[PDB]
Amino acid sequence: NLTFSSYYQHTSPVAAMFIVAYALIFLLCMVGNTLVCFIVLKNRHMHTVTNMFILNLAVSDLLVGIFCMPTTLVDNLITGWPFDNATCKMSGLVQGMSVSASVWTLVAIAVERFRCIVHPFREKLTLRKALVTIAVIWALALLIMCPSAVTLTVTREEHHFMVDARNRSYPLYSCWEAWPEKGMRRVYTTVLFSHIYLAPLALIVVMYARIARKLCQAPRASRRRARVVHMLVMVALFFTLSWLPLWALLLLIDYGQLSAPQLHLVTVYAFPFAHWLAFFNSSANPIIYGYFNENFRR
Amino acid sequence: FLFQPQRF
Amino acid sequence: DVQLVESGGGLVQPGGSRKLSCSASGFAFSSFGMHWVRQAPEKGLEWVAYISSGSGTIYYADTVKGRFTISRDDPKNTLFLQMTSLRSEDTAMYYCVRSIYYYGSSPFDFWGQGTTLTVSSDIVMTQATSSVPVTPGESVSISCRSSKSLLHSNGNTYLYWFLQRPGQSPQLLIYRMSNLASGVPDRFSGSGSGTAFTLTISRLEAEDVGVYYCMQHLEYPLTFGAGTKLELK
Amino acid sequence: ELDQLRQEAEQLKNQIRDARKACADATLSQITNNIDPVGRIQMRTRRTLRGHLAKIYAMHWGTDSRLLVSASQDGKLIIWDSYTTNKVHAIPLRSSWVMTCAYAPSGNYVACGGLDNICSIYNLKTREGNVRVSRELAGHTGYLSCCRFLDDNQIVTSSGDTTCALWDIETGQQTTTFTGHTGDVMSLSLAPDTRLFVSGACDASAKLWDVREGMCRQTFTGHESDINAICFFPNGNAFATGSDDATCRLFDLRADQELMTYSHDNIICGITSVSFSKSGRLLLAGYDDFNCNVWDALKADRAGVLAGHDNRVSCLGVTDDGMAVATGSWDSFLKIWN
Amino acid sequence: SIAQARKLVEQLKMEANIDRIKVSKAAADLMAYCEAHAKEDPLLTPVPASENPF
């Protein structure tokens, strides 16, 4: 029994609209990150802790924009994984550490902001502590993402082939998790879920609620703190709503056990939208942090 | 066909 | 004004312990480093220990490395030294010395008085001559030799001259070659060169009788000389 | 009664102007146009001192071309070693408002002063081992702006009450006072032979003073605003002045008129500090555009630009051997150029 | 008042009788003091065996 599949997962106009949308997203991320980085690096008067945090965030964003988008784009253009084992491993590790770096940097920015605002009496954060915390963040991300980059394997499908309009058959490959024990593939992904999404979001949300409580008791200033609260809550909601669907669908795959047609319908059309939203968050974060900072506009 | 991409 | 007085001594049996204390009176103790210098009953001077300002680096001698402890306390302006095990070679006279280090300072300026103790590779300084007849009114020169050159790449040399009057503590004459000290007449002049050093005095007086010593401050194990006398018939 | 005094003063001024106009046959540029230019000059930082944590206002070079003294508004005075970038002394101050400093030629004393209307003399080489205050000079009603050491026992000062003074150190009594200014005196420079000194004030004028006698000898004008700095030529027969009108002027002591004007359209900010170089070929000035400039003393053409600061450059000095140039500014950093 | 006029005439009458010399003499005399081992700052004249190793 041999199964034959089409080369492209969608038709011409679907590919057209995805390609133009993703090209627009790429150019937007490029221009925004170049502007923010040039502004930050050119001026020596902006040597503070928050500024170097923002520089780290921008560097992470440009890495994501230059790496994550094209590989997934071609992956959604071709039914297979048209790379070897080496690049599958390295790209997996790179995008994993990039996502973890973004999330952890947001958490650290939040905690420094809370320390500055709620309790300004204590000493300001030094540069050495900033370096130690950024190093710890990057190192812990790499350590927690390495095992997935080590275990995964690439395998050939003997009983499956793909036929194009030219009537030629290519071998089909796909890299996945061939873990020796099939049971704990789920436990690993739940560890990743409890490392990136649950605890960071919980801590940010409760502590920003604390900040809003602190400045809640405090005609001009009314609009002032109204806009302050508006922007804080909008940033938090943006992160949460952007990152919910991917994790929801992943856990649904890992435990939900959808039927064959449900599995097909989630595996053709929902995932490109989820990945687009995930990348949109990262490509739009510099716009939020630059257009809403008056000093950087100069 | 078992398309499931790298989960990030 | 400046006064260092040491206490603590007597008779100690072999295998016993003892401690010596040094007291200071008003010379900005916290900004001065201190040393220890021991003089055998026959003759000769030797170095024992050293503690830096701020209680940082500590150096010991190669002979008493494991049995001596040197310590200080900036409050109360007091210095300490501890003796664990005593051999028969430890009977000598002990002095306390102050020294400071910046660009143009003069180390080894003020010495103590003394405290008696009875128990019942390295740079070599020769100072071959032992005694020279002298008469007032004519110049007399003393010479000494060192193993290696004492001319660092900085452009400066490290050789010190000391004088010990009979029944008195040593005092400084030249801290670095061709550089006079304070409180001494202008007739003294080192004017050495290269590896062999010399010291010349132009005229003599009744207060110039004593034993002269040489010292080096390049490698921290500090070696004194032999000593030359001026009998002055 | 006062009207005829006024008209007599006007007539005297007109007569002196007419007389001085009779010795301007040839401009200096008419003759210094044939010799070769100095050319482009490039200098780079060779050391950087990073101890201060506030605004820096003054500095002075020691007589051995190896030690420095700097003053800043954190209440500290630091003695540097330029060769190894070390710190020799850290002298505290009673008043944190300091605008001048000096180094004795013998290397035994250091002086400072400012808005407290007192000049303080410190003894460096003491037998206790710490820097100690020796004498506090008082008797000025304005505010100190400069102080220089004539010898080990005499010191001259300039104040904002339109007077300058010379006084002893062993006895804290004024010896001679120089009067005749209208605005605040800002800076003074001592002659190499140490018999005369000149000062520049806020009333757009510069005056020469005789130390031994006690009265003025000459008066120079030509600026349209205040004068901030003034130096002395190595010859001793000239001096240069800086002003807030973005120009520098040279003077000659046997003609009694200005000779050279250094200015450009691009520069619009004022001049804070001026200093010369050995053999009288380089003129270094500080500006408000975070930059320092080097000029030829014989032609107004520019030769180079020193650009390494992030705020206003306030002080500038040149060593006696003429091998280094040091600059301090408002960014709490001192730099040495070679 | 009277003091200003007296000072003006004293310091601008005798000084008007002083001699005049050109700037050329002093300029040339102190220019002959450079372009040799006496002066260092113009261009890069000295050998790299300088006080500051950089």
Added chain:
Amino acid sequence: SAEDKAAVERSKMIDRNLREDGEKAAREVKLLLLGAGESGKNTIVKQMKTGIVETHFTFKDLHFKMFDVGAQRSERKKWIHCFEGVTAIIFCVALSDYDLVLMNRMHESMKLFDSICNNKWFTDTSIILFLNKKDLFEEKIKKSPLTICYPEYAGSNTYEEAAAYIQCQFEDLNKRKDTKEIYTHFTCSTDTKNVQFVFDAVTDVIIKNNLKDCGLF
């Protein structure tokens, strides 16, 4: 050589002491006090507690430093650079000088306020105004009319109206209504509430600067 190492150790000790002293001194709050001739400055100095006069006082664990430069009598521009980083300026104006003339004193006070407020050095520094002499103000308002100082003025002769007019007239010389803002408070005799107002202004300025420095807006 060993001597160079000892010199390096000494330099490092000096640097550590300097850094500790700077960190300790980077917490106190500084304010500059200025007035216009005859004014109740000394009354305020007594209430809370040569050239520059420095006064030190504390109030719930915050250290305040006051600088008085009244006895200078020189060109203010030349020595005004030294007060760039001050937290606030305390300005005192005599409210009872609206009748006495010498060219009214009130015009001189408002000229001084105009000079200080729009100075290029003080662009973000808040100004605390002090209407000092008001104990006998109402007496001379009900005995003499306000029209002598301000003939254009027209209104009732109650103390409320005159006080409001003088306050809104002084606050009307501010050019920047967004970068900086002005506090105003009427000084009472034998009153110990001045320190509380100074504290409130200082804390508001501290929160203002802290929020502006790093985060939002």
